[PDB]
Amino acid sequence: MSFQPTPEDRFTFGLWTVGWQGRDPFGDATRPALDPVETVQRLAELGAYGVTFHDDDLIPFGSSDTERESHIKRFRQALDATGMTVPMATTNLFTHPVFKDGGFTANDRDVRRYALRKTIGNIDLAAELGAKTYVAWGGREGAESGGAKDVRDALDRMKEAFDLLGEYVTAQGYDLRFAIEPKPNEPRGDILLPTVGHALAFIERLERPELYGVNPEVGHEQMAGLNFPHGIAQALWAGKLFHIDLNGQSGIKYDQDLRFGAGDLRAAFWLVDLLETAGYEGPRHFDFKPPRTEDFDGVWASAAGCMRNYLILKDRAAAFRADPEVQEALRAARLDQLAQPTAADGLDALLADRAAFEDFDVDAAAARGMAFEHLDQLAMDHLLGARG
Amino acid sequence: MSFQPTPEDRFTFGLWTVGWQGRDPFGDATRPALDPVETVQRLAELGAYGVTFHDDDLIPFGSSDTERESHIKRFRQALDATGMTVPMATTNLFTHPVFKDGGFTANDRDVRRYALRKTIGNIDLAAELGAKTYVAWGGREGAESGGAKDVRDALDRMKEAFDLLGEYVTAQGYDLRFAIEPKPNEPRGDILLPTVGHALAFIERLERPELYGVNPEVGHEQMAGLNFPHGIAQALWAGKLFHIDLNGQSGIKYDQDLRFGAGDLRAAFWLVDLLETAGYEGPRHFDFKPPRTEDFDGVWASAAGCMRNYLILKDRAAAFRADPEVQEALRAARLDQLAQPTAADGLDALLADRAAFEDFDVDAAAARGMAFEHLDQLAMDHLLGARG
Amino acid sequence: MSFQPTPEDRFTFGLWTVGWQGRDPFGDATRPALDPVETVQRLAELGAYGVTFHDDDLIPFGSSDTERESHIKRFRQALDATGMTVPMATTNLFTHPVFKDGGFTANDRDVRRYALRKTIGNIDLAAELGAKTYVAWGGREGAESGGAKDVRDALDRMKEAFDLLGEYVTAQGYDLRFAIEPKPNEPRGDILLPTVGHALAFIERLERPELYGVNPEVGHEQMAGLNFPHGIAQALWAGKLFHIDLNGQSGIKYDQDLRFGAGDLRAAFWLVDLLETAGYEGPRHFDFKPPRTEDFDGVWASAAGCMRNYLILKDRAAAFRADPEVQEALRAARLDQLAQPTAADGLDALLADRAAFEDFDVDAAAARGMAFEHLDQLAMDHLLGARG
Amino acid sequence: MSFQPTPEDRFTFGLWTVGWQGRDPFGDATRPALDPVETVQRLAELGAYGVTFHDDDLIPFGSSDTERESHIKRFRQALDATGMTVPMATTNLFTHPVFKDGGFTANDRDVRRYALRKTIGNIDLAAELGAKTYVAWGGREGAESGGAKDVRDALDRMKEAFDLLGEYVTAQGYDLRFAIEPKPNEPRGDILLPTVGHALAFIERLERPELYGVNPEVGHEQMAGLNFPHGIAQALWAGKLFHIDLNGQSGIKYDQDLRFGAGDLRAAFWLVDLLETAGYEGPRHFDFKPPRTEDFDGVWASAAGCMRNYLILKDRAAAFRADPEVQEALRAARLDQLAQPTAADGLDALLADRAAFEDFDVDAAAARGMAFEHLDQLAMDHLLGARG
Ligand SMILES: [Mg+2]
Ligand SMILES: [Mg+2]
Ligand SMILES: [Mg+2]
Ligand SMILES: [Mg+2]
Ligand SMILES: [Mg+2]
Ligand SMILES: [Mg+2]
Ligand SMILES: [Mg+2]
Ligand SMILES: [Mg+2]
Fold this sequence. Notes:
Oligomer: homotetramer
Binding site for Mg(2+) 1 (chains A, B, C, D): 181, 217, 245, 287
Distance between the termini of chain A: 14 Å
Largest sheet of chain A: 8 strands, parallel
EC number (chains A, B, C, D): 5.3.1.5
GO molecular function (chains A, B, C, D): magnesium ion binding; xylose isomerase activity
Active site (chains A, B, C, D): 54, 57
Bound molecules: magnesium ion
Catalytic activity (chains A, B, C, D): alpha-D-xylose = alpha-D-xylulofuranose
CATH superfamily of chain A: Divalent-metal-dependent TIM barrel enzymes
């Protein structure tokens, strides 16, 4: 029955999340702004651990440093008031007409110039609040048109931009690191660095890649219809899963930003299972919007569904891997053998074996049925009886 | 008028292309199996340059060392006869039942071990036909609904295969180069290395990344709904586009393999641009399937189609970047500036420079309309003319 | 723990289901044919209720009436042997080159002529085995090309065809009825009557529509990414849900034909819930293929996952609607008011009210938050604690 | 050369078209709000025939009976001034927060009751501007993740609205006609009546189906990945295509609203065919949004684009069905026969007729290649020329 987020399951929420007034393509804000002091108070009280924020979430675009300083101060009084942390921080580069056509990769050069600056102004802040990850999400970087942007030129600029930021952090001797969060489309026709692989492949070209990793969003990859779990496992493979955005989505459509556990449930389980197994140590961060039909408490309800959800799955998959029956389904499915190396020690000398080609009996191997519809149904009950 | 191809087009075809028979996932085969000698011979007439292959396309499954040979002499005699060429070869590791859970990533060690052997057999052939590049498309590497594969182990396994692969290719002085051929799903539910990005990233974890590069299909990225051109741009930036597969696909759906031009017409204009404006010297490989409703010149004409379509598109893009009225418009939207460094000398001291930020007029800049809509119309009247 | 199909939960399987040898686009049958006598024996024993069959599943295409009669006889000996029923029957019109390009709507006229005949030959059989539904699935009816078929002409033929079949049944005084099962694509580019609505809208034009209804497949509608439950509720709305095809799928891709409960779990629950509530009385029919990695028992495992699955969901949704807390979430969500009529008795005289326009307080109504993220999470646990 | 539109094109634009400002789901507004008088005036220059509208497009939300009036005189004075026209009007029932769970299908009876009233207010206007047809696009009618709406009650409710609607329209002698405007998702997660089919079907359950018909968008069916032309064919067969919304969409993704020609170029050729070969006399309504990267002639040119593109496409299809070489090919693939009754006199006695079946040569017929690939190439060289 009653799963309890304890500020140590590392649940953190982007200020923009519960803060979403409900304004959409086709309609008016269905709710009022929340004050970041108010937010922090209330996530603390649900068992949260921290907030994450875009510059503008905190500090409204007009920056009278006076005003500005008395924003951060108000903020910071809550963090200790409540004991909440700010793990991660980002820049808003997609809501001001300026950004119409990107930031790092905008056509005009002072827009690329402004945009770094805007961002360098907040890494610092990211530093001071002791965040340990600085995320970067393209948003206005792609092509609302067609051949309106030469993508290697553009891909040069992405690089230039990232290569300058890493230089600053190095220089200033800051203890952050970056996380490129890719997205297929919405709002630009086609966004640049559109999947965990792209982002991942891109990082390899940067001066110091050891500084850069990814920040995948469940629903973002779902939007190109891909296995998220498979994508995240690649990230982990690369030593690159530096942060995660947990939310729900229902297959290829606009960014929905549903509650976590909502949308694709089986993929939630398979996700969580993995995060629990591959030891992700990071912050179980949530980037969802409680829907706009959904009310002052609706926000929190939706906030909390987020946590009940990682917590049940976390469990159902726990009592899954530990099912003796289940562990004898897995071996039946030769998952132990996947785990063995194909050609070990001293040997590219499978060349000289017969048991491998000349003599190998295909139809023997042919005959052995994979035994996965049975493992699947063990995991479909969440073990036996009960679901998950 | 009509745009006849010639050998210097570098237009290739898989034997499995024009030679597909109709065996869909729900029907029978609508065509007689055509033979190599025949295939090579009409291609040569159509205006084709090379021919590509699979082991099993050429050498029937269980054949002998002699039944092998006679195939190969025969193939070989007709290349010269026609002076056609074989710039690329590939291994079938997905049709036979032993390959039901995969080849390099089977949960069963001696199939893993058998797919390496079968591959080496073919490298050696490909090798001796002067194949310049060696392709590799999984197909059976994924999971229909997994608990069935730890994607972290498979990637261990996947890597090991290729590393083994690159040793032999170098062990053996061949002048060959690997090319991972991504695909999202079908036949698997989820295919490991589903796209260009994942693949590109993957190559960088390999132990000799220079022997790798990527072999994309238009339809295959289209199945994830990516932006093919965009995608090839990222591969031509990585300097990793070793070979391409030209195609037509009408949306996130089963692998169609429509003739090139077919599918996203417009996507196609931008590729020949990219490809033609970018210097791709590789072959224009057509991995398309002539619809099953069609007889032999049914077959013979779609394949013709494939080539007129590169050629008309070659044309119309060529002229796009030569309409004086278009060059105006490339300036207009500042494509020029995309092509200028953002902050060029050492140059992080870009930092106090009061115009980047302090004294920058976002209000002024925001007002700049991108002049994208008129560049897009221009490339529609293919410039100020008759269609693109 | 251990949910028991009792031949009265109406679980029935298409002979082609468990019978699937595993042959796909890219590979060889991974299994042998099962003999329909063998199948029937084995579904009986899992708690099934009946089999459904295409003509050709039973009676292999060459029809020596001698042979043929001694096929049906063999069959029919099992049905009473086991007590299994044949509720539904169909025609295979998509695997013979003949059908390359449709049946009812094929370009050539004797192919449309053959095809009715082929089908009239089996309605009779459908009659004799006492089936009560005769399903029709397009499959080869659509456009692998582009403007290769004039769709109103074609839509005339669909009509002609259906209008002739209904005439026969009327005439012969048979007690069947038809169920058009639509599909978006796979194998023809674009299939005609592609969604429950299309099929539904089409039925209205036929001479006697009272004879015709739909036979939706979960994964078919999923393939156009639509809500199945919403689609089925429309069918029920029309008095047209005449049969159902239960299977799983993972979003927009090729027909997967996964186990029921597999793919989109939340939509399974929402489906089942509804079928259980809207009183569907029909046969909980399954059209799935146990995957080709998946073995002689794998087949049955997968068969049985099908049933464990409708049976748990059937339960979790049972103890959902009956949760007092849940019933006080629903009222909180004004679902009782949806159920009330907007403008009743004698009245289009909302015209004369003020409480409806002139005086109506928007912001009052504006303010009331829908209370659906809370109902959702009740249904996300399956009530409380336990999932579903 | 260049293809100038004129009034007899019957090309319309929504005021919300060229007048969109940029407010995306993640950015601010990139444009000043343009006024009606302005809108009507440049359209008139562009070469436009009519203008369509929403209540709130024209008359600002809470305006008075006088603030109303002055708007209307003003709109009205500029129609004549320019002699433009208003063939269609529509009600905004999706932007204001009172419309957060829907209009006709809100789970709250006095919003339901308020959306009927607001609509009647506008029918009366539309009515007195000589609007020929009255559109209706939900947008807020669906569920983001439902347990939230019984789709059976909503359809009860949905039906009731429209029936009420058709009474007044007839009660009041207006010469108006309803047109349900389908859409799959966005802003809702799932939108009731997601497509042409569902809508078409729906109209037949209404109590005066003749006052209904359908208003499709290219992008909206494209969001379900249907086959737009196909879809419009089904509406022109039902004789239910009252009005169309021309557009560009690049795949199963958020509502783009690209200029017509934009998106599926090729889909577009087949529509003007269909539309032009089929006699649609209705307006060619452009519901497109000028990308936010663009200023006023940014705006002004995409909208120009929309119209040259119908016109070039009009051309190229016209000529398609006039290439003597094409008419050969329509014969070749027997388009002729599709257009002949299958079994024409009374004619079920088609039954013994030994050629339909007994004496039919399936083997002979199967061998007929459909000559689809060459008809498709012909409509590519738009015939034997320069592009389509
Ligand atoms: Mg995010
Ligand atoms: Mg999101
Ligand atoms: Mg390929
Ligand atoms: Mg392909
Ligand atoms: Mg079915
Ligand atoms: Mg299916
Ligand atoms: Mg519209
Ligand atoms: Mg639209």
